[PDB]
Design a protein around this motif. Structure first.
Motif, PDB file in Angstrom:
ATOM      1  N   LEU A  83    -101.643 -49.128  16.697  1.00 16.14           N
ATOM      2  CA  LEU A  83    -103.022 -49.592  16.748  1.00 16.14           C
ATOM      3  C   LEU A  83    -103.933 -48.810  15.819  1.00 16.14           C
ATOM      4  CD1 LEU A  83    -103.662 -50.751  20.402  1.00 16.14           C
ATOM      5  CD2 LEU A  83    -102.386 -51.797  18.583  1.00 16.14           C
TER       6      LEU A  83
ATOM      7  N   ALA B 276    -103.985 -56.617  18.144  1.00 15.25           N
ATOM      8  CA  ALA B 276    -104.634 -56.254  19.408  1.00 15.25           C
ATOM      9  C   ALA B 276    -105.357 -57.469  20.011  1.00 15.25           C
ATOM     10  CB  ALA B 276    -105.625 -55.152  19.115  1.00 15.25           C
TER      11      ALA B 276
ATOM     12  N   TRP C 246    -110.129 -58.382  23.802  1.00 13.52           N
ATOM     13  CA  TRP C 246    -110.583 -57.536  24.903  1.00 13.52           C
ATOM     14  C   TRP C 246    -109.533 -56.499  25.306  1.00 13.52           C
ATOM     15  CZ3 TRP C 246    -115.249 -58.200  23.943  1.00 13.52           C
ATOM     16  CH2 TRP C 246    -115.944 -59.413  24.046  1.00 13.52           C
TER      17      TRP C 246
ATOM     18  N   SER D  64    -108.677 -53.940  23.840  1.00 15.29           N
ATOM     19  CA  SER D  64    -107.897 -53.856  22.611  1.00 15.29           C
ATOM     20  C   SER D  64    -106.935 -52.671  22.585  1.00 15.29           C
ATOM     21  CB  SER D  64    -108.797 -53.804  21.421  1.00 15.29           C
ATOM     22  OG  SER D  64    -109.686 -54.918  21.395  1.00 15.29           O
ATOM     23  N   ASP D  65    -107.294 -51.569  23.250  1.00 14.08           N
ATOM     24  CA  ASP D  65    -106.525 -50.330  23.264  1.00 14.08           C
ATOM     25  C   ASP D  65    -105.283 -50.499  24.145  1.00 14.08           C
ATOM     26  OD1 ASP D  65    -108.816 -48.415  21.935  1.00 14.08           O
ATOM     27  OD2 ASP D  65    -109.797 -49.456  23.659  1.00 14.08           O
TER      28      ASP D  65
ATOM     29  N   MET E 196    -101.099 -56.673  40.571  1.00 14.73           N
ATOM     30  CA  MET E 196    -101.542 -55.331  40.217  1.00 14.73           C
ATOM     31  C   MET E 196    -102.788 -55.391  39.325  1.00 14.73           C
ATOM     32  SD  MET E 196     -99.765 -52.143  38.289  1.00 14.73           S
ATOM     33  CE  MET E 196    -100.018 -50.463  38.881  1.00 14.73           C
TER      34      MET E 196
ATOM     35  N   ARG F  93    -110.111 -64.495  28.788  1.00 13.79           N
ATOM     36  CA  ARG F  93    -110.964 -64.647  27.615  1.00 13.79           C
ATOM     37  C   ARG F  93    -110.182 -64.368  26.330  1.00 13.79           C
ATOM     38  NH1 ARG F  93    -117.370 -62.918  28.058  1.00 13.79           N
ATOM     39  NH2 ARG F  93    -117.376 -64.797  26.749  1.00 13.79           N
TER      40      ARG F  93
ATOM     41  N   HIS G 211    -109.213 -65.217  19.218  1.00 12.84           N
ATOM     42  CA  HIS G 211    -108.364 -64.852  18.104  1.00 12.84           C
ATOM     43  C   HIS G 211    -108.036 -63.356  18.189  1.00 12.84           C
ATOM     44  CE1 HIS G 211    -107.272 -64.457  13.814  1.00 12.84           C
ATOM     45  NE2 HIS G 211    -106.790 -65.659  14.058  1.00 12.84           N
ATOM     46  N   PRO G 212    -106.746 -62.944  18.106  1.00 15.33           N
ATOM     47  CA  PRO G 212    -106.374 -61.518  18.079  1.00 15.33           C
ATOM     48  C   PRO G 212    -106.747 -60.842  16.758  1.00 15.33           C
ATOM     49  CG  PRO G 212    -104.479 -62.866  17.559  1.00 15.33           C
ATOM     50  CD  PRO G 212    -105.579 -63.831  17.986  1.00 15.33           C
ATOM     51  N   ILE G 213    -106.768 -59.502  16.774  1.00 14.29           N
ATOM     52  CA  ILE G 213    -107.149 -58.678  15.639  1.00 14.29           C
ATOM     53  C   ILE G 213    -105.867 -58.148  14.982  1.00 14.29           C
ATOM     54  CG2 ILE G 213    -108.508 -56.634  14.959  1.00 14.29           C
ATOM     55  CD1 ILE G 213    -109.846 -57.371  18.015  1.00 14.29           C
ATOM     56  N   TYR G 214    -105.624 -58.534  13.729  1.00 11.56           N
ATOM     57  CA  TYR G 214    -104.449 -58.079  13.020  1.00 11.56           C
ATOM     58  C   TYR G 214    -104.652 -56.625  12.594  1.00 11.56           C
ATOM     59  CZ  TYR G 214    -100.813 -57.943   9.464  1.00 11.56           C
ATOM     60  OH  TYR G 214     -99.642 -57.628   8.827  1.00 11.56           O
ATOM     61  N   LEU G 215    -103.687 -55.761  12.879  1.00 10.71           N
ATOM     62  CA  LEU G 215    -103.783 -54.365  12.459  1.00 10.71           C
ATOM     63  C   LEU G 215    -102.715 -53.973  11.443  1.00 10.71           C
ATOM     64  CD1 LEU G 215    -104.749 -52.937  15.931  1.00 10.71           C
ATOM     65  CD2 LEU G 215    -106.323 -53.449  14.061  1.00 10.71           C
TER      66      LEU G 215
ATOM     67  N   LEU H   5    -102.361 -43.008  26.285  1.00 12.03           N
ATOM     68  CA  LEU H   5    -102.234 -44.277  25.570  1.00 12.03           C
ATOM     69  C   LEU H   5    -101.642 -44.093  24.166  1.00 12.03           C
ATOM     70  CD1 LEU H   5    -105.207 -46.543  26.868  1.00 12.03           C
ATOM     71  CD2 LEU H   5    -102.801 -46.800  27.293  1.00 12.03           C
TER      72      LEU H   5
END
Lengths: 224, 224, 224
Positions: free
Chosen positions: C24, C84, C87, C89-90, C151, C162, C167-171, C205
């Protein structure tokens, strides 16, 4: 104003002048080690290069003389073992600090940055006749004390209690250049002096975990 | 599709081609500085080595001639000061951007990544007769505006309000190679252009704080 | 006890002996690449320096002989694309793993570290006559399955839902030295073997995301 200079000295330690890695990041620890090796090798290479330049110049001179001559005739350290709690791993972690030359001389330092709590305990064993919690116990105790905080979120308390009955995650060892007695005093300064503590236990998590290590190396001098 | 290339250019800045450190990590800032010094020294060492190779080769040639000869006869920049809020330090932080050559030319840029809010204010002082919030005020104001968000969690609002009446944590200075006027325009682009803003204020916290710096250096060109 | 050695081998991978960056963090990926280049150049410079020392010494000897002579006469790899969730995202992210030599051979690996869930799906297309979810579908499906967890926090479930429609974030991309078949097996080992999974999906993380990559490179051997 006093706050200003405190922030400034703290910042100066964890900037340059100290290679402190995040205790919860074995990757950053590796990276810091790698940068150090590279720096050390580069200094050595600079030395070799200049040695070669000097030998070269000396041979230039010698060559001149040989030309001229021919022309005439022409005619140990305390180990800080790091463990994260199995829950809230980023905020809840524990140091086990071990003396290099005593079989049973060590202490515990537990942190919950969610509530900004630090707990110290001596784990040393000493027999006395004119002539002592275990690590696990200290671990279990720590979660009890932390779950006690009124400041602790209901959900926080629940994860503290679950961590208490689970196995921590070992993240490795740090070794700094100071005595057991000095780091031990630093650890206690951290817990007893309220001012230092308020200056160390704040800000972004990554920075605060490095500041914690700085506090372990310098105590109050972390703000000198 | 348009999104694709945006992501690609953003990613290209914060990958290679820009040494941007996380503004909340003085440690990463040190590390980036150290890598730069190492790169710079290594280039210099490559130059010295090749110089030595050339001098050596020239001496080889000269040695040949001396052999042969003997044989015959044988027979400033805007400063970005970084402060984290005392609560939610990882998500709530503030830039104080200072012009290098005006006593009272600076601006404020406040961020709450929990609600993805950015607030800009000019702090410059200008007197006019034909011939202005303080930093603190801007800080206090910022927490009020942020605690206003309907999107803000009840608990979030409470920590915003506590940060408002507490002292922020200074994390140091960044200096990039652009004018006050340009960074100032970039900062305002960040707040006024909704598209850019939505592209900058998202993703993992570490990455997003670097992207923020990229946006400060390039504005909309961060997606060019 | 068994736990001890597991922790030890895991720790050994993500320490030294493997340059694994946080998936990430494109910034850490750049940094790891830069350290590697510096290491590689430094080795080369050491070689050049020693070459120059040897040439120099040989010329010293030759110079001696010339002196003496004159004196007498004096009289491809699988690509792991990283995204990611918009929401959390981490904690919520996805790998798209692509075979280097098949037009439609790839798989999905989705992670929610908040609930410590991993989902694998084959996305390959194969036609059969004696002689297949899309990436998007797999993405959408993943958020449904994750929001299913008992859980999962109520608020967690809401952000999952949501993310599902956003749309996801390309890393970017990671490339390790193993076959499609091997990484594919590793990915499935990660999901099917409960023990390995419990050892990989825990701790801070940053560390856990690196451990995930280690698991992709070695499977169960990540604890060998």
């Amino acid at each position: 104003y006093g706050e200003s200079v405190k922030q400034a000295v703290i910042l100066n330690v964890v900037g340059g002048g100290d290679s402190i890695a995040d205790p919860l990041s074995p990757g950053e620890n590796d990276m810091v080690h790698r940068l150090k090796r590279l720096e050390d090798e580069q200094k050595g290479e600079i030395i070799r290069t200049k040695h070669n330049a000097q030998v070269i110049a000396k041979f230039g001179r010698d060559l001149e003389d040989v030309y001229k001559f021919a022309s005439r005739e022409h005619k140990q350290t305390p180990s800080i073992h790091i463990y994260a709690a199995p829950w809230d791993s980023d905020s809840v972690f524990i140091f086990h600090v071990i003396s290099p030359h005593h079989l049973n001389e060590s202490f515990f330092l537990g942190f919950d940055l969610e509530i900004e709590y630090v707990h110290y305990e001596d784990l040393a064993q000493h027999w006395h006749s004119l002539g002592g919690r275990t690590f696990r116990e200290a671990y279990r105790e720590f979660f009890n004390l932390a779950s006690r905080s009124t400041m602790a979120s209901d959900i926080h308390k629940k994860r503290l209690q679950r961590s208490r009955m689970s196995h921590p995650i070992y993240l490795g060892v740090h070794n700094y250049e100071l005595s057991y007695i000095a780091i031990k005093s630093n650890a206690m300064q951290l817990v007893t002096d309220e001012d230092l503590q308020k200056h160390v236990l704040r800000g972004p998590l990554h920075f605060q975990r490095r500041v914690i290590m700085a506090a372990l190396k310098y105590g109050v001098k972390v703000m000198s």
